[PDB]
Design a protein around this ligand. Structure first.
Ligand SMILES: COCCOCCOCCOc1ccc(C(C)(C)CC(C)(C)C)cc1
Ligand SMILES: O=C(N1CCOCC1)N1CCS1(=O)=O
Lengths: 224, 6
């Protein structure tokens, strides 16, 4: 059984874009590392969130705010001792420029040919991130850095390091400097998982909080 | 369905 959801934000760019309408395959068992997962937001389960399951139960996960890379050690209730091969391709320009605005503290995303410049805005960087045996793209913002003082600090771990409790997950957005995720709010209980996002049903050209120009039928199909 | 996912 499939459940459709609309994508209002850029947190999962470039993989999912604002105005995408996705289909979720409801989960039993269990997300694989790197799965795109819809889940009930722990602190407000009236809200559905969509993120990538980067950390599974037992993983020691560490995030470097400067290089903006993950380190993952599985089977590590304490505290372990076994590295997942996590590798990154070289940074390259992405298809998007992010431009900030006022009246509505906000930002807009614009797909800009890589041979072009947008007058106002900052071009996001792109890399591929491989977590063991699965690979996806991530966008970073060169002038942005995570303020570790705002991080969720797990009891008894140092900052920017987490050990995923049994029965729980660590979620991260692909638009890494524009995603409020487990780094800020902690783990996602297994019960809170709705399902895996497997396809784009429909897509509309749109910005956050407005209507759409037109469509993106090229996007209908599996999620890559 | 047809709700948002943040
Ligand atoms: C100028 C530099 O700022 C660039 C990006 O702007 C944002 C917007 C939102 C955010 C999030 C969603 C991550 C807010 C947070 C970190 C409190 C969860 C981070 C950076
Ligand atoms: O928190 C988020 N949004 C998603 C939808 O609008 C309100 C809040 N996403 C997580 C960071 S985001 O891309 O702005």
């Amino acid at each position: 059984i499939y459940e459709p959801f609309q994508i209002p934000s850029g947190s999962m760019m470039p993989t999912l874009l604002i105005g995408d309408f996705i289909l979720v395959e409801k989960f039993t068992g269990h997300p694989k590392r790197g799965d795109i997962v819809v889940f009930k937001y722990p602190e407000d389960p009236k809200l559905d969130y969509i993120k990538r399951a980067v950390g599974l139960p037992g993983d020691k996960v560490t995030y470097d705010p400067v290089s903006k890379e993950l380190t993952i050690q599985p089977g590590c209730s304490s505290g372990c001792e076994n590295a997942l091969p996590v590798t990154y391709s070289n940074v390259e320009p992405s298809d998007f420029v992010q431009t900030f605005s006022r009246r509505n503290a906000t930002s807009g995303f614009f797909e800009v040919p890589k041979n072009e410049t947008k007058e106002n805005g900052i071009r996001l960087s792109e890399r591929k991130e491989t977590l063991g045996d699965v690979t996806h793209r991530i966008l970073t913002v060169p002038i942005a850095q995570d303020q570790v003082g705002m991080y969720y600090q797990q009891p008894g771990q140092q900052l920017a390091t987490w050990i995923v409790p049994p029965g729980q997950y660590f979620m991260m957005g692909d638009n890494r400097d524009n995603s409020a995720d487990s780094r800020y709010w902690g783990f996602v209980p297994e019960a809170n998982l709705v399902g895996r996002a497997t396809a784009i049903w429909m897509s509309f050209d749109k910005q956050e909080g407005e209507w759409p120009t037109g469509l993106r039928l090229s996007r209908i199909g599996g999620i890559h | 369905x047809x709700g948002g996912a943040y």
